[PDB]
Amino acid sequence: LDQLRQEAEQLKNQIRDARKACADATLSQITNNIDPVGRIQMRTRRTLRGHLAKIYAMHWGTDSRLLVSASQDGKLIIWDSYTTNKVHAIPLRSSWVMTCAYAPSGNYVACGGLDNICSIYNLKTREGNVRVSRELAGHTGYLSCCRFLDDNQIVTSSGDTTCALWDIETGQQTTTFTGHTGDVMSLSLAPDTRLFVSGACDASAKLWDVREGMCRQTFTGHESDINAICFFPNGNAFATGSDDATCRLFDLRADQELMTYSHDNIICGITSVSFSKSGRLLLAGYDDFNCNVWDALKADRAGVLAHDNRVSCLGVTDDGMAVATGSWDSFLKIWN
Amino acid sequence: TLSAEDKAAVERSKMIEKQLQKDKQVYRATHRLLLLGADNSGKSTIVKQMRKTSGIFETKFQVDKVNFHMFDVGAQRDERRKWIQCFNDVTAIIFVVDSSDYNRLQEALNDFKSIWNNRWLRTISVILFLNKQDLLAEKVLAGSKIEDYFPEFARYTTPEDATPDPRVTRAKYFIRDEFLRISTASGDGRHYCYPHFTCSDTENARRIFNDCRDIIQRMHLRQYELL
């Protein structure tokens, strides 16, 4: 019993020393030559009304025009962000929904929550109604996130400490990703859809392999729960937002902790994070009714997006045209 | 909207908005309740009396032409600090305690203390149910003492304002006073506790109705500077 612990401690110390060997210089020293981008103003352009209760999640579309949002009253609404028209309105079986996703091909949507189920809806039918096509059961804890790989594969994050990979055609899991300690909160796919990251309440983030299904890397440095995780456009970095009013940037090849985005006048935790198209600007939502914009290369605050209640979700379009933010006051605002 | 197809799209959106208005009008006249408890507590049979790893349940009952929705949390693991934020807008919380064990009551007290002092549960009042009274009545006279579990039981006497075998009442009101001292340790007059002596009964719905009416009346009185 005491022999395995000693070996584990020795391995951890060796890994820490090895990582520290390649520390070299810092990012701030290198980047300080670049002049700052300056100050950014974004004006609200549209406001979307129609949700009864507070808004929990939203997702854009690849066509850069449509989006889907979920609400506590148990309603899914598909919007037309140009003319503010409503295309569909779907009622749910269970009203406690925590996440939603929109298919890359625009053929399906998914949602789930405290019912331990992920549901798939078919938007393209010969009849003029949207119906549910497949229910994915097998998880123990509540569902917290989900993302589409293609029309037949989806990855889910649950509160029972484990992730999973599903086959929608048959409805049975094909891989299970165990190894975390607490319940998992979010995940982020990669542009090539070969790897994905994940964050949990044990203040640790892991890197997974979809093909062969075991953990490849582990990152630490946060002090409290992990609420939202993003992933750099290049594919070799990712960003995290936690409950201790701090944001972190980690690299995959180097395996150290990069520059830190924090300010002494913020006490509340972060709810969502998202990057820009070129990765120059990182913007995150907070609990103090605001949404801050950070310079991703210099940890400088530049811009504020000032809602009535807590901001629960963000989103950036594929072509970088606009940013949409939801909140607990049931209003969606499209900024530019 | 300069094209005919855009006009048809706008008309479809307007019909969707009409349906949403109907849904809002239906939604604004309902009260949501959250039910919490333990395994030994009779919170499972309370639902049946009022009337596949699912993660949540739902029960509907009506009294005096008023709609009530009760949500029972199902297959979720030990700790609850994450999904408790979704219930910070319900009317009240129902708590069920099995007061017939003398051993796990400390765990129930700790759970009640954790729930009452939560940050996200401020301004929500709790309705406290004390279940399985006949078991307590059959167990007190056997003599299963309480002084060993609680050293302060020796210096306790039945309160004068109590309105009930005197020792059965002594035990009942000792447990009730423990729960109420936990409740009164804080609160600042923003949420209250409504204890009850529930048995295997049929008037639980009426008690919930009265407690909810009192809570809403107090909230409205506080809003208008009348209290």
């Epitope: 025009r65 449509l66 037309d80 028209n85 295309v87 010969r126 009849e127 003029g128 109604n129 | 300069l2 094209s3 005919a4 197809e5 855009d6 006009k7 048809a8 799209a9 008309e11 479809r12 019909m15």
Partner: single-chain antibody, 233 residues
Amino acid sequence: VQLVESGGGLVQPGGSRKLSCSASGFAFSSFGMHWVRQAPEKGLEWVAYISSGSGTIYYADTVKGRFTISRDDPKNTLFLQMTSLRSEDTAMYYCVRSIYYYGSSPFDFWGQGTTLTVSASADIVMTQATSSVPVTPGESVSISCRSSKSLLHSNGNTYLYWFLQRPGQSPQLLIYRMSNLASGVPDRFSGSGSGTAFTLTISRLEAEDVGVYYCMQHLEYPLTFGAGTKLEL
């Protein structure tokens, strides 16, 4: 998904007759409805239109005071009321679905139709340059259409449709908005144009492509069809 029309017959001049279209198999309460007429030896023609919520109704300038449309959502039935039948209303009538939102495909399903025999300006005109062409089973084919006004809109859409009914069957839909392919049609058809001149191309050819091809506009009411272009093999 199927629609059945009932009624028809022989009517003395000046009489009245009521037509019924019965829909069963889809969410009928969410589709607009049209009536389209085909003369015994001429092209197609539009008659009336009623929206999903009955909040908008349009009529043809040819017939405005004598015809009446009505829908009954609980029974899933569509009605047409005709009074004082002239000598021109001696054709076959069709029942057509239509749904309008961002990205939909209107005019997708057509009914079977019923026959009716009667004893004895500011709109856009669409002209088909050729009335018949000879083709070969395996070569490339091209059909052209002409318009009197630019169909391109400010938003960016060009409202042109191709139907290509077969000799003995109801019309179907090939291309909507001049570029987008239909659902169940083979992917060997294509469409292109510039706003006033349009063309339809077929790469291969098979024995099922024989029929008449039509050209319709949807920029503003009334809806004006073409003349037709028969292909003989």
